[PDB]
UniProtKB/Swiss-Prot annotation, chains A, C:
Its cofactor is pyridoxal 5'-phosphate. PANTHER family: BIODEGRADATIVE ARGININE DECARBOXYLASE (PTHR45229:SF3), CONSTITUTIVE ORNITHINE DECARBOXYLASE (PTHR45229). GO terms for cellular component: cytosol. The gene is cadA. GO terms for biological process: arginine catabolic process. Its main location: cytoplasm. It comes from the Bacteria. The lineage of its organism: Bacteria, Pseudomonadati, Pseudomonadota, Gammaproteobacteria, Enterobacterales. One of its GO terms (molecular function) is lysine decarboxylase activity. InterPro entries: OKR_de-COase_N (IPR005308), Orn/lys/arg_de-COase (IPR011193), Orn/Lys/Arg_deCO2ase_major_dom (IPR000310), Prn/Lys/Arg_de-COase_C (IPR008286), Prn/Lys/Arg_de-COase_C_sf (IPR036633), PyrdxlP-dep_Trfase (IPR015424), PyrdxlP-dep_Trfase_major (IPR015421), PyrdxlP-dep_Trfase_small (IPR015422). It is found in: Cytoplasm. Keywords: Cytoplasm, Decarboxylase, Lyase, Pyridoxal phosphate. CDD domains: Orn_deC_like (cd00615). This is Inducible lysine decarboxylase.
């Protein structure tokens, strides 16, 4: 932060001479001087250059063209406008947040002006930063307390060993001096929630529109376990969603509760829809309570909103129909449903305080924002616990939290506040819609097959596309209107290979080959499998990383139409088995795999398996108690009919749990076992595309085994 | 009875490649450092079962044709590690052997000359299929015996006798097909 | 790491000219050149300067005076010795680890020599660093993958916001690029325990002498809870120590177990002794099983070795007498009992594998070493079941661990290997013994009172001082011989105020007044209270911090003998209450507090309130279940006899728990309640010395109220 802009040349000498005198004075305090051209030149030095903090221009030249466009981006940006004798303000400059510093063209006084710019810049630093981050930067330059934790104390112990000096020179002196415990008084303590830490929780909840936002120092997986131990006593009932995460599985194994699983909608491409509106009515909550033995009134409900693919629900209908006093929204993938008008009434934080209910959201921090790892937040919309609830938070968090993660956690809430932060959300949507239009433009004009985006036929608007009932792009049979939405920054590339009715085609390329092709250039696919490709277009993906993805997609069509070899295209796959992948081309591999999907019938064995629910014998908490005693056996793949499993089957593809730990597979869930036996044959003929199931371990012959319980 | 008869048909097709005779060792689930192994489930249930071998070896300066292992001692060596102890020819004390894991999931017995020997189990409509089928067939006669006594009720419609009896004969006609 | 040493001068020209040509070549690749004098000059450039990696000297001048002293300090240190025509090795140079690189005195080839030194230095960096840390440093300069977690992606999102640029420029470019999740293939995953993470666990256990070691990413408070969830099923019995930590209290409240508390020894000064050998017998443990309702055979034991003060135990007698298959040693304060001959057979790792038993240790990493916060280890010595113990490790650790802490956790284990690491433990012991001798030297020669060190009369030896039964310095009534040892680096300062028999004295100065004077200069007191102190002298405490502590102690005697004012000595205490601390001097405050200790009788009430253990009605797990339902209330301190408390009382002083959450104060534990009422009267007359008890809320009248359970 040391860029000073000097716009417009008046041509005279009594105004340009103080500019040259100030040019030699600002460089003595480390400041970069730039000279833009016209009015449009200065506008490009703010959005693309965020390290600017000084604009010098003539007040009697552009008093209305510059004081309006700059205020729409950065409001607290200082403006070093030089006025004259006959200078005045304007009536249209009253409702604009600006910082104008008036000066003169006095010769010899350039030294006093340089001291005022440095002091004004320091005021901008001490304003946009939160009090928690301000206390961390000040403690390094002044706080030098001895005999404290940790033992390195800013890297002192590393300067006494040759191997330790290599680790200290990598980061920096300011990095090691910022890792302190709670042994400092002027920085407060996270476990006590006082001082700077008390105002930090009120600053995040106010910006993100909440009542009390916490700062979890152990990722999102820990935040979902602390909240689950609150509204679920030892012997209750929860309404957990079927499409749950691995962190939510361990929650049911540590609390003696009786969960009730839902049946979300799904199609044939593997993209799971959402929970229908019929599962939220009053005739449905108490419907499965009396049928399932040992179950009381549900006091907590976990809703995956949004899912792993990015499909927002309708919170305006759930907060009124679902009669649960503790509704949880797994918003671990949408930490931005507030800074845009196309997200009002779509999340739990949007709206007001529901009478007699509370909204629980565990939005991830180190996923689609800008902070260090092991960080999460807990949003509150209503009345919760804090005194006794703090005891449960300390059970998973050590007494010496890492302030480097806490300082970056609150930073994500400060980088989004104001118009300067809202341009990152709207900018990511505009870059996502532009990327969606480039696919349809390069599809009809091209000569041959091309990728397709799972989007409606009309994408001219800038909002969330609803999933209606008279459309064919979503393919969800019997879907509720005004319930399922679409995330514009979640572009889902549908590779050719299937029709629009749910059957199979004759010419197509699976998404598994394209997934490994993007890794050669440096692009990691988020989700892949059947005929879908998921990507993340958050604030981290700028215009460079967004346009580079389309260039890699056009190279796959060129290499496939010309019929190239595997060695001259995929060097990583060739090193796995050079003997088998010797005389094989790119067209021979794509056609042999496509015939195996039709022969083994993948869409039918997948749509019928994940739809039905296996018979749950006991609670997931009882399955963990049997493992601690040492009564876990295993059988073959064709011998697990009628046994109680102990693990959570997570087959890749897709990416959702299949059988929960503590369920029995009988005659009702026969297609469930058929999906596991199909993957054991399709992923054994060609190396590289082996079967990946978090539960079905690989042996040495081909058949997989699962962990069950003893009889 | 349908949930039990369908499992017999699937089990009958699996035993076609087990009843020349090898012994495939399965790997138990879990996150452990050493690659642990697990025994066979319903295939073997005895405690002091015997195991055969192909190429004989000269162990302890004597020949052997069958080596018996303990079920209570095999589950601990294949999990916690250590050394296994097994007697020879079903007599003597449980001497120590140089048993390791094979790449094709077998039991290779090493001696003083570093020689391989894959172990196997002694072999016998299989016996396990016939045993599990007669228990299910006997349950059908017990349920049909109660229906062949209370059918004389006057307060029962006559049209329902054609559907209840047809449902019992459908299972009986299917359970007698796999035993052919 | 860029210091090159050129020792000695042969006086000729054919040997000094290649040195001058190499002087201009090494500076082009960023290297510092130093010219030491005699043999004693080079020895000072290694112990004090750790950033050295090049030693240039004549081989035909000092072939035995340099190859022996350098080998005693570093094994892999490159030696750029220049040999001649008639040069050979020595018979006494066969059992020494050295790296000698021979060269010649050829002109013009100075450029080729500079390339060999840079490549040799790179080999030294890739050798002393572990494969996990080396892969992290190489991934920054080469690995540039896109579409991965977290969202910052090496600090990309911070370069688009004005507030984000200030947070990115504080640390460094290499700091943000090193924070990666499990989205990297060539580095493995921590939860999967494969790849570089697999060899990292075996490397730490080999250095610290263990079979398997873990890397907890959530501090020591989390590692102690994972061990308790393994050898203690739902309905068992554990042998937890009385001197437990706040983290160990939550372990008893999350598992339905029946703990059995011991009876450690103690003196009058407040120094926590240890558990006698009679409690480890078979007839003593089995006697408390029948007396405690709902308790079976203990299958786990928790031993705090060492305590918070610094007194080791004797593991050679515990591992044979204590018949517990799961013995735990909370080594959260001794991460060095291995690399020294005076620490053999004192910890759980020293020795061999005990059959039928196993040792669990949770050594703290960011306490007395050099690493980032939220770091711990799990030392297991025996044959256990990792498939069960790892299940509890994944439930308390997120799926995306912070590799910045893991890289520093293994770094602490790499800083101990070789002679460069052995001098850190022995160096802190030599500085501690020297500091102990400076106290006794400045005590007799001084004219008046002086501080005393809790040490035997003979400290001439260099080992752990045993606590015998024929001594008067320890003051423990009936102590077991060859069972309690003294920690040399843990210097316990005793202020004059009590006698050698356990009574009081007329002239005395409490330790709380001295603790406030040390904070003015920046010295933070670790433990303080009645008449005792404690300081941490780990490997990070150099000779500067050791000599600065004695100077601050001598200044307290000068300010007290001359009778100065509080305002002209303690400016921090004066700002708390300038009206009351106006006409008060340093001698008036030191005498008024000493009379309150004798009047209220502190040593007698404290010694009798810790031996008699309160009656435990229910298990600590049942007390937490009644708190979530809303059946808790607060009562007065004078009205609580016969009620079950809900929190843990932790009065300062000392630092040990008083009443466990779930105990009842009856007629047997009468002095226990008198200890709480005594601190409320002595800490309410003078500002700054308020009563600090964790669990006692302060009201408006001065009577503390504790939270109990409803009847
Ligand atoms: C990725 C994810 C997590 C894990 O996130 P961490 O912050 O790394 O713990 C938890 N829940 C959901 C729904 C996720 O997608
Ligand atoms: C300080 C301490 C802890 C807490 O250490 P962390 O690494 O911060 O979790 C736990 N146990 C004991 C005995 C301690 O002294």
């Amino acid at each position: 932060m040391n860029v000073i802009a000097i716009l417009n040349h008046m041509g005279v000498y009594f105004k340009e001479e103080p500019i040259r005198e100030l040019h030699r004075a600002l460089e003595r305090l480390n400041f970069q001087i730039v000279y833009p051209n016209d009015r449009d030149d200065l506008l490009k030095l703010i959005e693309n250059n965020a390290r600017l903090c000084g604009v010098i221009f003539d007040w009697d030249k552009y008093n209305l063209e510059l004081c309006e466009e700059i205020s729409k981006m950065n409001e607290n940006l200082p403006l070093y406008a030089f006025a004259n004798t006959y200078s005045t303000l304007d009536v249209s400059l009253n409702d604009l947040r600006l910082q104008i510093s008036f000066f003169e063209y006095a010769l010899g006084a350039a030294e006093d002006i340089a001291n005022k710019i440095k002091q004004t810049t320091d005021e901008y630093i001490n304003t946009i930063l939160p009090p928690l981050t301000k206390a961390l930067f000040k403690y390094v330059r002044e706080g030098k307390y001895t005999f404290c934790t940790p033992g390195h104390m800013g890297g002192t112990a590393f300067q006494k060993s040759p191997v330790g000096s290599l680790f200290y020179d990598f980061f920096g002196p300011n990095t090691m001096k910022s890792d302190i415990s709670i042994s400092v008084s002027e920085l407060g303590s996270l476990l006590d929630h006082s001082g700077p830490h008390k105002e930090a929780e009120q600053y995040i909840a106010r910006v993100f529109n909440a009542d009390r936002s916490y700062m979890v120092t152990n990722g999102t997986s820990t935040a979902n376990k602390i909240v689950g131990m609150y509204s679920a006593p030892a012997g209750s009932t929860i309404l957990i969603d079927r499409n749950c995460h691995k962190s939510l599985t361990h929650l049911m194994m540590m609390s003696d509760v009786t969960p009730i699983y839902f049946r979300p909608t799904r199609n044939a491409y593997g993209i799971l829809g959402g929970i229908p509106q019929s599962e939220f009515q009053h005739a449905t909550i108490a419907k499965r309570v009396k049928e399932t033995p040992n179950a009381t009134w549900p006091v907590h409900a976990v809703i995956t909103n949004s899912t792993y693919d990015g499909l927002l629900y309708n919170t305006d209908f759930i907060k009124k129909t679902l009669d649960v006093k503790s509704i949880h929204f797994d918003s671990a993938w949408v930490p931005y449903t507030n800074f845009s008008p196309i997200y009002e009434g779509k999340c739990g934080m949007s709206g007001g305080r529901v009478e007699g209910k509370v909204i629980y959201e565990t939005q991830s921090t180190h996923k689609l924002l800008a902070a260090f790892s092991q960080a999460s937040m807990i949003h509150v919309k209503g009345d919760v616990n804090e005194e006794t609830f703090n005891e449960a938070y300390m059970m998973h968090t050590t007494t010496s939290p890492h302030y480097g993660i806490v300082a970056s956690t609150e930073t994500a809430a400060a980088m989004m506040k104001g118009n300067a932060g809202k341009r990152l959300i709207n900018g990511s949507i505009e870059r996502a819609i532009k990327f969606r239009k480039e696919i349809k433009r390069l599809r009809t004009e091209s000569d041959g097959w091309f990728f397709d985006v799972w989007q409606p036929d009309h994408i001219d608007t800038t909002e969330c596309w609803p999933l209606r009932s008279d459309s064919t792009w979503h393919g969800f049979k019997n879907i509720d209107n005004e319930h399922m939405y679409l995330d514009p920054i979640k572009v889902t590339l549908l590779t050719p290979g299937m029709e629009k009715d749910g059957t199979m085609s004759d010419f197509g390329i699976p998404a598994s080959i394209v997934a490994k092709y993007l890794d050669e250039h440096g692009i990691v696919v988020e989700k892949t499998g059947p005929y879908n490709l998921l990507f993340l277009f958050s604030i981290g993906i700028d215009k460079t990383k967004a346009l580079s993805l389309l260039r890699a997609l056009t190279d796959f069509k060129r290499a496939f139409d010309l019929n190239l070899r595997v060695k001259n295209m995929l060097p990583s796959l060739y090193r796995e088995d050079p003997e088998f992948y010797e005389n094989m081309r790119i067209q021979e591999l794509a056609q042999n795999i496509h015939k195996l999907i039709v022969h083994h019938n993948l869409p039918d064995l997948m749509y019928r398996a994940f739809e039905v629910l296996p018979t749950m014998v006991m609670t997931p908490y009882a399955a963990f108690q049997k493992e601690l005693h040492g009564m876990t056996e295993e059988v073959y793949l064709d011998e697990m009919v009628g046994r109680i499993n102990a693990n959570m089957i997570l087959p890749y593809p897709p990416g959702v749990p299949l059988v929960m730990p503590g369920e029995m597979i009988t005659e009702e869930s026969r297609p469930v076992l058929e999906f596991l036996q199909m993957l054991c044959e399709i992923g054994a003929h060609y190396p590289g595309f082996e079967t990946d199931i978090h539960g079905a371990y690989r042996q040495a012959d081909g058949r997989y085994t699962v962990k069950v319980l003893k009889e | 009875m349908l949930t039990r008869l369908g499992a017999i048909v699937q089990r009958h097709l699996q035993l076609q490649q087990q009843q020349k005779t090898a012994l495939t060792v399965i790997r138990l689930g879990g996150i452990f450092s050493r690659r642990q192994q697990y025994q066979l489930p319903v295939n073997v249930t005895a405690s002091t079962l015997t195991l055969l071998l192909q190429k004989p070896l000269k162990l302890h300066d004597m020949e052997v044709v069958h080596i018996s292992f303990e079920r209570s001692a095999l589950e601990q060596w294949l999990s916690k590690g250590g050394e296994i102890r097994g007697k020879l020819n079903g007599i003597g004390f449980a001497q120590k052997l140089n048993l390791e894991v094979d790449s094709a999931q077998h039991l290779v017995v090493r001696d003083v000359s570093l020689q391989g020997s894959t172990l196997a189990l002694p072999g016998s409509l299989p016996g396990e299929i016939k045993q599990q089928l007669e228990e299910l067939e006997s349950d059908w006669r017990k349920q049909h015996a109660l229906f062949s006594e209370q059918q004389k009720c006057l307060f029962i419609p006559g049209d329902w006798l054609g559907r209840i009896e047809a449902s019992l004969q459908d299972v009986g006609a299917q359970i007698r097909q796999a035993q052919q």
